[PDB]
DNA sequence: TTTTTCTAATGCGATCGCATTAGATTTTGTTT
């Protein structure tokens, strides 16, 4: 009745009877086309209304694209014979805590703390802890262990008292045992485990201040929502009386707090008349460090039973639509030994990083200019591989608000006003495109600033009232006009009279000052003149959304705040807002490409110790904030037994072999990043890997991957003292300004804007 | 008798005044009755009526909270009782039964064990009035033979929204016009003449119903979808700006009707003041900065003397206002008179200038101390006899009254000053000195406040699917909404009908595409394209940006340059090419020196820096550096203690513990772990010096170096840490460092600091190259990196490195290399290499 | 004028402790 015929493999997911059901949706098989064709079949054949439907996803982008295929296929269901509710996982628990929030007594007025303002609140419970921490580290380095245990105790539901007795029955197996041959390194293992129990009373003063202020986290939401469903069995009773068909998408990324919340509510053996469908594959489970549950695909079927002991059914649904063959024979051999999907390459190895980027800038510029996306694991790595492809002539879209050169000239110049001791935001102003100072006039302000300026006296400086000979009081008192040039004295006086006016608007309300500095600067007119004509009128998207964050914050001191808040956002958040474009070659990373497709895909740097990222990897016995697997949930993550050791040659052999199982398991999370990169292709595929790196004295070869893919493609282009190149830059408009100077439906606007300007 | 006259605008409250004159009143709002007599005294409520019949909120809120703390609840709610979010769900259960007249016993008949406990709590609250049970008590009090005979005409005028307990205070007095309007929640009179709606607008409303229009109106209905939340907020500020300026309907004839003003209407009024369109417009009184300027003078007077931290807040406030760069001119000119060599604080010096008279040096900074003396003499020589006396003795308030006249920045700033200053005077008279301090345009609005407006032009913003039909459920613990109906999409559709009824000229319905609701598509069939991603504006800082975008590009150029010519002739900052940013010139482009007998002065700690990046040298020196960096001034306190020649091991440790308290650490658990880390960094020195006293011999400690290494001829200036003397007559060089991480041995002999000290030992200021050590206090013993004695060949290989680099500081256009130190540099954001 | 990271390896030598240091210092969403 208006669509395509469904596949014979899709005619079992669509016509499956009500009851719990699993769909192992493979790579590129389109689990959204074959999901809106079950909401329709569970409406047109009875069994529901279109208001008893619930759809849950992780991201909000994959939620808005599920309304647009439920609502479409239901308007064409009403053409031949109430709207469905789709929402994310973390917004389904904010709903569940505004209704039933007072049973387990959490307030309904509870604000949600931001990543930046959460760091602001735990830094002050570490800097105000009366005690003796005795930790080699610093504040602002032990408050990033508080925020990583308390974000991992409220994710496995541990309740902070099981963690106090873990260091025992391992600190006695080192001392009370005898040798068979304390070893000075196994004590260093034991040093980190007596460090958690020294910062347990730190993270418990964090929870007692997040309840005297009634604020929560995003991981604190699913902690309270998980407990409420299990404790009170009346919450799930009034939700199976409202929603009678529930959808769960990308369920392989579901953590452990989102698992016993959705299994007590929706059918842990509750009501067999409910049609419940959870999808996702076990083989694109690429996160593992963020939601981290290695379960939920094996432990679903015994978890959502038929309420009479019989476990659920499981459906294959494996087909590839946006994928050609000869790129499946690789991806079936990558994921071999870890039902293979069936359908409906140019390997290389250079010996220079800077020259292997020329090899991928050949194919990405020869097939473009003859008539695509580059998947790089590290974002920092992505930036260099955009100049080697700009010179070839291909347009580039590589995908920080506080680093945008119109916002960053408004963060500074708001900092010269407040404190005239930040000198690094005076050289941003004096050397910028407005008032270009030369080298001889910068070095003559500093001579003015000095002429204006024992153990008991060295500590007298570095006081909060110390006089330090800053530059910015040689602007407001430049002296005698014979040290500067006649062109450079006329700008210091002008700069001085601009800051004397803007410093009187300083006790004024705070979003009325960020919109006042921005008018005195040339912003919002120089931000649009640097935009091409093909864009339209759009020039000030990411400068307006700065000021929709100053006024949200100030609901403000402008010196104590917004300078502590913006600078804590640079490190902790690395930019408050990215700012979207109108929306070329996309040089996005490998995690941002989950769910997309292109034509030519280049995976450039498959060297050793780069793609696998073996380096900078730590486990629970070499750092504090890493939650040992005795009490970790879903304990995959094999735990050492500790009970079969009576000799020191046994103990340090258990530890040195359990430290390999917890790192073999992180090489297995890499092969799932090949598979979520290889299958994003739809056409030819570009695999490569350099040999000489960039900053070594000894080369790193190919990884275990590129040495395997040469054996896959053969069972294939034969492309099989580093450098001292040092980049350095010395420190139209002239065509256009001829026309405006020589001159002296746009014309009706100018005649309208002058009707207000020439009329008091 | 009793008559009734049951559409929008059709002449109902106008007809009720004609009956109220031709024979010679009840409105329901304290604002609606203001204009209701404006039509009666030009021709010639309920909750204020039942008060006089019963004569002839936070105080209420605390009473439920106290009795919940002391207290037949079903024992599942026992954790929730001590909260303050249970005293609002319980407060609104007793309010939705008072509007419907339910006894506390009458709720106990409804039981469901949860309602029985509220049925017992309610009759316990009677035994211990309000503005809700005022009508419900006058009905229970009811004199009616004297009351009903006193009235000749009854005019209720508004019965579409009127509670049933208020429906029987009128029907008890049931002359008696019962006007109403039965849609937008006895002989009958209907009306059809709209009288306040175009026939294009009236057909849009009654199309949604599945009354005619004014034929003299000219109307249009349109629906415009945007593509982003930013573009949706700009085409509204476009449309309110096209209409006033091109067409010409004035302000206070336009309104932006939103469903709920926190979710949309607060973020939209910010994106609409920026485009020049006025908004008619909350905050506490204690947080008002101009109010607490003079309340501090009360706070000081009630304690007899002014503190340190409470006296700087007067200089940073509106009484005597200093910018942040004249504190730094006061503080240098107050430490020059009281010139102790360890100088005082700034709080302790500020009191000694207000109290007495500083007469060492004062020219313009004495005037800013008189206006703090004269206020703090009027605070010494009813409290409001001194409030105005302190107000008037200052030079304050004669400023803004000569400044609220002009000014667009200070003009609204001066008006919010006195409107917050006067609102603190009236809080003082309502108290009747220690107790007064201890106790202290376009109308954007919601649909329920948009029922008393004329409003030619109407914009209904935010008609999207998330919030105009509220699927936001309202279940709860007590179950109020299940009780309110036993005792919705079609309901919210009336609000979109009752919003478009207020528009006579035009209607604009705006959404985004974040989806369109299923109401906007139901407007399209009665109304008169892709979504917009880049919208046109009419701001004068918006044309001048687009015209400059086409005139500097890879026909229209001749059109645009004529328009920029007439913009620049009258004003419009940004149109003249003397004001562009890419058309400015450098000031000098002249070198730092000339006259080739000039001799530069290096320094051995900034000589590796100057061979590493020369732009880094020019902007760390010559200003530009983040600040104090306390890890420096602890690592220089150690160089002072070690440098003394006559102290033992216990002599040094006691002189560090006495001075350590004046070091600005937060986290006082870290100020103790950094002292014990720096006690052991003095043990590690004397453990090392006595271990190598047999090998070396001290000559002098902390020697100034100043000579001529080469003769442009360079000049070497520095302070050698500790110079030694080897057993073969040589002279090794020790540079004591206090870091943790030592430099590698491959980099320990190319070290540009030690290779200038021993180059300064040769050729005067001895005369043997000697050697070089690098002692790392911190991390057997303290690790040391060594450098060889110099050759007559490696000297010339190093003497050409000093002389070639020292000429790179002369000329303009410095190099900017990308080094290993880019991650730790202050000057990074102005780097051309980044 | 002179100053300021830390881990986990990778080699040493009298297994394992002491030492140097050469490679880096990842990826990143989730309410109103
Ligand atoms: N014959 C008339 N002469 C003058 N004005 C008229 C006439 N008929 C209607 N109007 C206008 O129509 C409006 C009457 O408003 P009214 O009927 O009181 O509003 P409503 O929509 O019924 N709401 P409410 O007043 O609260 O009951 C006024 O603006 C009148 O000026
Ligand atoms: S970023 Fe590079 S060029 Fe800029 S100051 Fe630092 S080292 Fe010099």
Closest of A532, A520, A433, A485 to residue B583, by C-alpha: A433
Burial of B439 (0-12, 13-18, 19+ CB in 10 A): exposed
- Is residue B528 within 8 Å of B211, Cβ to Cβ? no
Contact between A377 and A286 (Cβ < 8 Å): no
**Cβ count near A138 (within 10 Å):** 13
If one counts every other C-beta atom within 10 angstroms of the C-beta of residue B422, the result is 10
Taking alpha carbons only, the member of A599, A178, A525 closest to residue A372 is A599
Question: Which residue pairs, CB below 8 angstroms and at least 24 apart, start in B374-380?
Answer: B375/B297, B375/B319, B376/B297, B376/B300, B376/B306, B379/B297, B379/B300, B379/B301, B380/B301
Alpha helices per DSSP H over A335-390:
353-366, 379-382
Separation CA A507–CA A558 (nearest Å): 9
Backbone region of residue A462 per phi and psi (left: phi > 0; alpha: psi in -120 to 50; beta: other values): left
State how far the Cα of A263 lies from the Cα of A252, in Å rounded to an integer. 15
3-state secondary structure of B602: strand
Strand ranges for B190-232 from DSSP E: 220-225
**Per-residue tokens: A461:** 């400086």
**Spatial CA neighbour of A130 closest among B672, B659, B658, B631:** B672
Tokens matching residue B287: 């947080």
Q: How far apart are the first and last CA of chain B?
A: 88
Q: Would the CB of B822 count as within 6 Å of ligand 2?
A: yes
Rounded distance between C-alpha atoms, residue B498 and residue B11, angstroms: 16
In three-state secondary structure terms, B442 is strand
Closest C-alpha among B774, B778, B784, B798 to residue B722? B774
**Which tokens sit at B637?**
């306190």
Does the CB atom of residue B618 touch ligand 2 within 6 A? Answer: no
Scanning A217-236 for CB atoms below 8 A from B yields none
Neighbours of A198 (CB within 10 A): 16
* Side-chain half-sphere exposure of A90, counting CA atoms within 13 A: 14
Determine whether the interchain pair B619/A472 forms a contact, defined as Cβ–Cβ distance below 8 Å.
no
Partner A contacted by B304 (CB < 8 A): no
- Residue B568 in contact with ligand 2 by CB distance below 6 A: no
State whether residue A201 sits within 8 Å of chain B by CB: no
- Beta carbons within 8 Å of B232's beta carbon, 6+ residues apart: B226, B461, B510, B511, B512
Residue of B nearest to A510 (CA): B289
SS3 sequence of B48-101: CCHHHHCCCCHHHHHHHHHHHHHCCCCCCCCCHHHCCCCCCCCHHHHHCCCCCC
Q: CA–CA separation, B50 vs B142, rounded Å?
A: 11
d(CA B565, CA B560): 9
Distance B11 CA to ligand 1 centre (A): 4
Chain B, window 362-391: residues with a beta carbon less than 8 angstroms from a chain A beta carbon: none
Pick the atom of ligand 2 nearest to B818's CA.
Answer: 2
Asked if residues A190 and A169 have their Cβ atoms less than 8 Å apart, the reply is no
> DSSP assignment of A719-731, as one string?
---------B---
Q: Ligand 2 in contact with B821 (CB < 6 A)?
A: yes
The pairs formed by A708-711 with CB atoms below 8 angstroms and a separation of 24 or more are A709/A330, A709/A347, A709/A606, A710/A347
Select from B477, B591, B815 the Cβ nearest to the Cβ of A102: B477
The C-alpha atoms of residue A195 and residue A134 are separated, in whole angstroms, by 10
Structure tokens at B560: 């645009």
Cβ of residue B624 closer than 8 Å to a chain A Cβ:
yes
Residue partners of B310: CB distance under 8 A and separation at least 6: B296, B299, B300
Provide Rg for chain B, Cα atoms. 41
Q: How far is CA B578 from CA A430, B539, B564, in A?
A: 19, 21, 13
Annotated domain spans of chain B: 1-56+130-191, 57-128, 192-277+441-467+488-528, 283-440, 592-643+686-834
* CB-based contact, A197 to chain B, within 8 Å: no
Shortest Cα distance, chain B CAs vs residue A535, angstroms:
8
B623 part of contact set with chain A, CB < 8 Å:
yes
Both tokens of A685, joined, read 């595929």
CA A357/CA A361 separation, integer angstroms: 6
Name which of A57, A52, A50 is nearest A76 in CA terms.
A50
State the Cα–Cα distance between residues A640 and A657, nearest whole angstrom.
10
For residues A556-591, b (16+ Cβ closer than 10 Å) or e, as one string? bebeeebbebbebbeebbeebbebeeeeebbbbbbe
Which of strand C's nucleotides are less than 7 A from any protein C-beta?
A: 1-9, 15-32
Closest ligand (CA of B833):
2
Helix (H) or strand (E) holding B704: strand B698-707
Distance, CA of B31 to chain centre:
33
Query: Is residue B494 helix, strand or coil?
Result: helix
**8 A C-beta contact, residue A102 and residue B83:** yes
Helices (H), A452-563: 455-458, 489-502, 511-520, 541-553
**Torsion sign, CA atoms B322, B324, B330, B335:** positive
Burial of residue B75 (number of CB atoms within 10 Å: 0-12, 13-18, 19+): exposed
CB crowding A607-644: b at 16 or more within 10 Å, else e: bbebbbbeeeeebbbeebbbbbbeebbbeebeebeeee
CA–CA gap between residue A563 and residue A310 (Å, rounded): 60
Indicate the residue of B549, B581, B673 with minimum beta-carbon distance to A522: B581
Cα–Cα distance for residue pair A312/A297, rounded to 1 Å: 12
CA A119 – CA A566 distance, rounded (Å): 12
Per DSSP, helices labelled H in A8-142 are: 36-39, 41-44, 61-75, 89-99, 115-122
Can you tell me which residue has the tokens 């541990």? A158
CA of A552: which chain B residue's CA is closest?
A: B267
CB contact under 8 A, A757 and B571: yes
What contacts B799, CB < 8 A, 6 or more positions away?
B709, B710, B759
Write the residue with the smallest CA distance to atom 18 of ligand 1. Answer: B13
CB contact under 8 A, B323 and A539: no
Which letter does DSSP use for residue B717 in this model?
A: E
What are residue B5's phi and psi, to 5 degrees?
A: -130, 70
Residue B707's DSSP bridge partners are B716
Cα B333 to chain center, whole Å?
34
Kindly list the structural domains of chain A, giving each domain's residue range(s) and its CATH number in brackets, ordered by start: 20-104+221-315 (3.40.50.300), 114-209 (no CATH), 346-399+584-616+647-714 (3.40.50.300), 408-572 (1.10.486)
3 state DSSP class of B712: coil
| Residue B620: CB atoms within 10 Å | 19
CB contact B827 to A (< 8 Å): yes
The one-character DSSP state at B462 is -
Cα A324 from chain centroid?
31
Residue B451 to residues A71, B582, B590, Cα–Cα distance (Å)? 34, 53, 71
CB B526 within 8 A of CB B481: no
Residue A524 backbone class (left: φ over 0; alpha: ψ -120 to 50; beta: rest): left
Q: Considering only CA atoms, which of A159, A256, A167 is closest in space to residue A637?
A: A256
Question: What backbone torsions phi and psi does residue B460 show, to the nearest 5 degrees?
Answer: -100, 105
Distance B12 CA to ligand 1 centre (A): 6
Strand A275-279 to strand A20-23: parallel, antiparallel, or no bridges (unpaired)? parallel
Is the distance from CB of B732 to CB of B772 less than 8 angstroms?
A: yes
Contact B538 A753 (CB under 8 A): yes
What gap in Å lies between CA A400 and CA A417, rounded to an integer? 23
Q: How far is CA B329 from CA A474, B311, B497, B642, in A?
A: 11, 17, 65, 36
Rounded to whole angstroms, how far apart are CA atoms A128 and B671? 12
Instruction: Count other C-beta atoms under 10 Å from residue A737's C-beta.
Output: 20
| Interatomic distance A265 CA / C29 C1' (Å) | 24
Does the distance separating the beta carbons of B637 and A105 come in below 8 Å? no
The H or E element spanning position B684 is helix B670-689
Edge-to-edge order in the sheet of strand B254-258: B220-225, B506-511, B457-461, B254-258, B443-446
Asked if residue B772 lies in contact with residue B733, where contact means CB atoms within 8 angstroms, the answer is yes
Cβ atoms < 10 Å from Cβ of B754: 23
Q: Which of A281, A173, A130, A300 has the alpha carbon at shortest distance from A654?
A: A173
Which chain B residues are closer than 8 Å to A457 by Cβ? 341-342
CA dist., res. A154 & res. B745, Å (int) = 48
Query: Which atom of ligand 1 is the closest one to the Cα of B451?
Result: 26
Helices (H), B501-555: 521-524, 540-550
**Per-residue CA distances from B127 to B120, B121, B123, B645, B716 (Å):** 12, 10, 7, 87, 93
Sign of CA dihedral B7, B10, B13, B19: negative
Q: Which of residues 481-500 of A touch B (CB under 8 A)?
A: 484-485, 487-488, 491, 500
Report the structure determination method. Answer: cryo-EM
- Please say whether the dihedral angle defined by the alpha carbons of residues A488, A489, A494 and A496, taken in this order, is positive or negative: positive
Taking chain A, what is the end-to-end CA distance rounded to the nearest angstrom?
A: 66
DSSP single-letter state for residue B824: G
Chain B residue numbers touching A435 (CB-CB < 8 A): 584
| Strands B188-189, B4-5: pairing kind | parallel
Cα atoms in the Cβ-side hemisphere of radius 13 Å centred on A590? 26
How far is it, in rounded angstroms, from Cα A322 to Cα A254?
Answer: 26
DSSP A283: T
Measuring from each residue's beta carbon to the nearest atom of ligand 1, which residues come in under 6 Å?
A: B 8-14, 158, 195-196
**Kind plus residue range of the DSSP H or E element containing B787:** strand B783-787
Residues 644-683 of A with CB under 8 A from B: none
| Residue linked to tokens 């803007």 | A502
Residue A740, φ and ψ in degrees, nearest 5: -75, -35
Q: Which of residues 107-146 of A touch B (CB under 8 A)?
A: 107-109, 126-135, 138-139
Contacts of A558 (CB under 8 A, 6+ apart): A414, A418, A506, A510, A513
Q: What is the full DSSP assignment across A67-86?
A: HHHHHHHHHTTSS-----EE
Tell whether B341 lies on the interface with A, counting CB pairs under 8 A.
Answer: yes
Residue B751: C-alpha distances to residues B212, B607, B706, B787, B789 (Å): 94, 10, 20, 8, 13
Of A99, A508, A541, the CB nearest to B413: A508
Q: How many CB atoms are located within 10 Å of the residue B527 CB? A: 17
Dihedral of CA atoms B622, B628, B630, B635 in degrees, nearest 10, equals 30
Q: Is B292 on the interface with A (CB under 8 A)?
A: no
CA B180 vs CA B9, B158, B160: distances in Å:
12, 5, 5
Q: How far is the CA of B260 from the C1' of C32 (A)?
A: 12
| B753 in Cβ contact with B607 (< 8 Å) | yes
User: What element of type H or E holds B698?
Assistant: strand B698-707
DSSP state of A312: P
Query: What DSSP string runs through B210-239?
Result: -----TT---EEEEEEBSSHHHHHHHHHHH
Give the span between the Cα atoms of B206 and A248, in whole angstroms.
42
């Amino acid at each position: 009745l208006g669509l395509f015929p469904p596949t014979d493999e899709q005619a079992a997911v669509i016509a499956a009877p009500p009851g719990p059901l699993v769909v192992i949706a493979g790579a590129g098989a389109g689990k959204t086309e074959t999901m809106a064709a079950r909401v329709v079949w569970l409406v047109a054949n009875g069994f529901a209304t279109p208001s008893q439907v619930l759809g849950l996803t992780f991201t909000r982008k994959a939620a808005g694209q599920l309304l647009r295929r439920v609502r479409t296929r239901l308007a064409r269901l009403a053409g031949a014979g109430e709207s469905a509710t789709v929402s994310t996982y973390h917004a389904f628990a904010g709903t569940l805590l505004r209704e039933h929030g007072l049973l387990l007594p959490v307030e309904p007025d509870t604000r949600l703390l931001s990543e930046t303002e959460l760091w602001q609140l735990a830094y002050d419970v570490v800097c105000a802890h009366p005690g003796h921490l005795d930790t080699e580290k610093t504040p602002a380095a032990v408050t990033a262990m508080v925020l990583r245990l308390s974000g991992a105790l409220a994710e496995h539901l541990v309740d902070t008292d099981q963690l106090r007795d873990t260091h025992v029955e391992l600190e006695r197996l080192v001392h009370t045992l005898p040798a068979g041959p304390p070893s000075q390194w196994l004590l260093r293992m034991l040093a980190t485990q007596t460090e958690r129990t020294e910062l347990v009373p730190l993270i418990d003063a964090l929870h007692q201040r997040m309840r005297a202020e009634k604020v929560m986290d995003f991981g604190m939401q699913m902690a309270a929502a998980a407990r409420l469903a299990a404790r009170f069995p009346q919450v799930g009773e009034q939700l199976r009386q409202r929603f009678r068909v529930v959808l769960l998408d990308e369920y392989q990324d579901t953590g452990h707090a989102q698992r016993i919340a959705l299994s007590s509510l929706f059918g842990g053996g509750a009501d067999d008349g409910l049609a419940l469908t959870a999808v996702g594959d076990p083989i694109q489970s690429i996160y593992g460090w963020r939601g981290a549950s290695a379960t939920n695909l094996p432990r679903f079927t015994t978890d959502f039973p038929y309420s009479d002991g019989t476990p659920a059914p499981t459906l294959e649904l494996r087909t590839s639509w946006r994928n050609p063959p000869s790129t499946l024979h690789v991806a079936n051999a990558v994921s071999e030994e870890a039902r293979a999907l069936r359908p409906r390459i140019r390997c290389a190895l250079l010996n220079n990083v800077a020259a292997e980027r020329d090899w991928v800038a050949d194919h990405l510029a020869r097939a473009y200019h003859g008539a695509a996306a580059v998947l790089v694991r590290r974002n920092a790595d992505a930036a260099p591989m955009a100049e080697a492809l700009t010179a070839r002539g291909v347009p580039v879209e590589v995908v920080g608000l506080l680093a945008v050169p119109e916002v960053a000239d408004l963060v500074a110049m708001l900092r010269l006003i407040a404190d005239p001791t930040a000198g690094s935001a005076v050289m941003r102003i004096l050397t910028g495109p407005r008032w270009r100072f030369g080298a001889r006039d910068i070095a003559a302000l500093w001579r003015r600033a000095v002429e204006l300026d024992g153990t008991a006296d060295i500590v007298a400086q570095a006081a909060p009232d110390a006089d330090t000979a800053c530059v910015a009081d040689a602007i407001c008192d430049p002296g005698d006009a014979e040290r500067y040039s006649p062109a450079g004295y006329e700008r210091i006086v002008a700069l001085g009279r601009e800051l004397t006016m803007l410093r009187a608007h300083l006790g004024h309300p705070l979003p009325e000052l960020v919109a006042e500095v921005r008018r005195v600067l040339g912003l919002d007119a120089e931000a649009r003149a640097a935009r091409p004509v093909a864009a339209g009128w759009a020039g000030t998207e990411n400068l307006d959304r700065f000021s929709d964050l100053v006024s949200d914050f100030a609901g403000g001191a402008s010196v104590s705040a917004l300078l502590a808040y913006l600078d804590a956002a640079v490190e902790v958040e690395n930019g408050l807002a990215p700012a979207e474009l109108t929306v070329r070659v996309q040089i996005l990373t490998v995690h941002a490409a989950k769910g997309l497709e292109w034509q030519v895909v280049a995976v450039p740097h498959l060297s050793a110790r780069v793609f696998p990222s073996t380096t900078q990897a730590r486990t629970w016995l070499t750092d504090a904030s890493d939650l040992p697997p005795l009490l970790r949930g879903d304990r995959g993550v094999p735990v050492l037994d500790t009970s079969d050791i009576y000799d020191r040659k046994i103990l340090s052999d258990k530890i040195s072999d359990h430290k390999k199982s917890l790192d073999q398991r992180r090489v297995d999370e890499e092969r799932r990043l090949l598979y979520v990169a290889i299958t994003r292709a739809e056409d030819t595929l570009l695999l490569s890997g350099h040999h000489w790196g960039a900053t070594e004295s000894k080369p790193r070869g190919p990884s275990e991957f590129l040495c395997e893919l040469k054996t896959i493609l053969e069972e294939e282009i034969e492309h099989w003292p580093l450098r001292d190149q040092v980049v350095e830059a010395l420190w139209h408009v002239h065509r256009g300004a001829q026309l405006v100077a020589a001159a002296m439906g746009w014309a009706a606007d100018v005649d309208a804007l002058l009707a207000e300007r020439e009329r008091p | 008798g009793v008559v009734r006259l049951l559409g929008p605008g059709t002449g109902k409250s106008s007809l009720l005044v004609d009956t109220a004159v031709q024979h010679i009143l009840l409105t329901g709002s304290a604002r609606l009755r203001t204009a209701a007599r404006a039509a009666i005294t030009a021709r010639l409520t309920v909750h204020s009526y039942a008060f006089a019949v019963l004569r002839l909120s936070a105080e209420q809120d605390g009473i439920i909270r106290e009795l919940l703390a002391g207290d037949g609840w079903p024992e599942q709610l026992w954790p929730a009782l001590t909260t303050a979010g249970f005293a609002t769900e319980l407060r609104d259960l007793m309010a939705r039964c008072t509007e419907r007249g339910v006894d506390p016993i009458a709720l106990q008949r409804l039981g469901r064990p949860e309602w029985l406990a509220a049925g017992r709590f309610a009759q316990a609250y009677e035994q211990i009035l309000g503005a809700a049970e005022l009508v419900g008590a006058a009905l229970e009090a009811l004199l009616l033979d004297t009351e009903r005979n006193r009235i000749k005409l009854l005019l209720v005028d508004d019965a579409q929204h009127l509670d049933p307990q208020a429906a029987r205070l009128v029907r008890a007095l049931a002359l008696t016009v019962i006007a109403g309007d039965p849609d937008q929640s006895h002989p009958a009179i209907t009306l059809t003449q709209s009288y306040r709606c175009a026939p294009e607008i009236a057909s849009a409303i009654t199309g949604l119903g599945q009354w005619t229009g004014n034929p003299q109106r000219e109307g249009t209905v349109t629906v415009r979808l945007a593509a982003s939340t930013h573009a949706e907020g700009t085409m509204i500020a476009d449309a309110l700006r096209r209409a006033h300026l091109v067409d010409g309907i004035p302000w206070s004839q336009m309104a932006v009707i939103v469903r709920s003003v926190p979710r949309v209407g607060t973020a939209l009024a910010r994106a609409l003041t920026a485009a020049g369109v006025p908004v008619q417009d909350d905050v506490p009184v204690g947080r008002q900065p101009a109010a607490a300027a003079l309340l501090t003078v009360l706070d000081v007077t009630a304690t007899g003397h002014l503190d340190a931290d409470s006296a700087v807040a007067l200089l940073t406030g509106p009484i005597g206002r200093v910018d942040p760069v004249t504190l730094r001119q006061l503080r240098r000119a107050l430490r020059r008179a009281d010139g102790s060599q360890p100088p005082r604080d700034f709080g302790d010096l500020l009191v000694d200038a207000i109290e007495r008279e500083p007469k060492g040096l004062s020219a313009e900074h004495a005037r800013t101390l008189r206006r703090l003396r004269a206020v703090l003499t009027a605070a010494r020589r009813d409290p409001r006899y001194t409030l105005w006396q302190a107000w008037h003795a200052s030079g304050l308030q004669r400023r803004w009254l000569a400044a609220s006249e002009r000014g667009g920045s200070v003009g609204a700033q001066a008006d919010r000053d006195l409107d917050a200053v006067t609102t603190l005077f009236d809080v003082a008279d309502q108290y009747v000195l220690r107790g007064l301090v201890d106790h202290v345009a376009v109308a954007v609005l919601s649909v329920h406040g948009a029922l008393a407006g004329e409003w030619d032009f109407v914009v209904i913003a935010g008609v999207q699917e998330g919030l105009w039909p509220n699927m936001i459920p309202r279940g709860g613990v007590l179950g109020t909404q299940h009780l309110v109906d036993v005792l919705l999409v079609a309901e919210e559709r009336r609000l979109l009908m009752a919003a478009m009824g207020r528009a006579r000229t035009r209607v604009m319905i705006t959404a985004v595409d974040l989806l369109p609701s299923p109401f906007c598509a139901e407007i399209s069939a009665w109304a008169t394209e892709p979504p917009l991603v880049a919208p046109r504006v009419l701001a004068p800082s918006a044309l001048v940006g687009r015209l400059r975008a086409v005139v500097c590009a890879p026909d229209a150029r001749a059109c645009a340059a004529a328009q920029l010519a007439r913009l620049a002739a009258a004003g419009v900052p940004g149109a003249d090419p003397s004001q562009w940013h890419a058309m400015t010139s450098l000031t000098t482009e002249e070198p730092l020196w000339s006259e080739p007998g000039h001799v530069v002065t290096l320094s051995p700690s900034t000589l590796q820096m100057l061979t590493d990046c020369p732009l880094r040298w020019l902007l760390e020196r010559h200003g530009g550096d983040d600040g104090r960096d306390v890890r420096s001034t602890v690592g220089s306190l150690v160089h002072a203690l070690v440098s003394e020649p006559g102290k033992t091991e216990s002599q040094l440790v006691n002189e560090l513990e006495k001075v350590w308290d004046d070091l600005p650490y937060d986290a006082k658990w870290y100020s103790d772990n950094e002292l014990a880390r720096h006690r052991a960094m003095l043990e590690t020195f004397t453990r090392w010096r006595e271990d190598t006293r047999r090998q070396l011999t001290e000559v002098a400690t902390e020697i100034p170096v100043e000579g001529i290494v080469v003769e442009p001829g360079v000049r070497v200036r520095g302070r050698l840490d500790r110079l030694e003397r080897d057993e073969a007559g040589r002279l090794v060089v020790v540079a004591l460092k206090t870091g943790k991480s030592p430099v590698t041995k491959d980099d320990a002999q190319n070290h540009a600091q030690l290779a200038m000290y021993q180059l300064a030992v040769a050729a005067g200021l001895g005369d043997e190259p000697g050697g070089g050590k690098l002692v790392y206090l911190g991390k057997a013993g303290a690790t040391e990196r060594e450098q060889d004695p110099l050759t007559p060949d490696k000297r010339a290989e190093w003497l050409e490195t000093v002389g070639e680099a020292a000429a790179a500081t002369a000329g303009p256009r410095f190099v900017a290399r990308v080094n290993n130190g880019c991650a730790n540099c202050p000057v990074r954001s102005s780097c051309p290499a980044q």
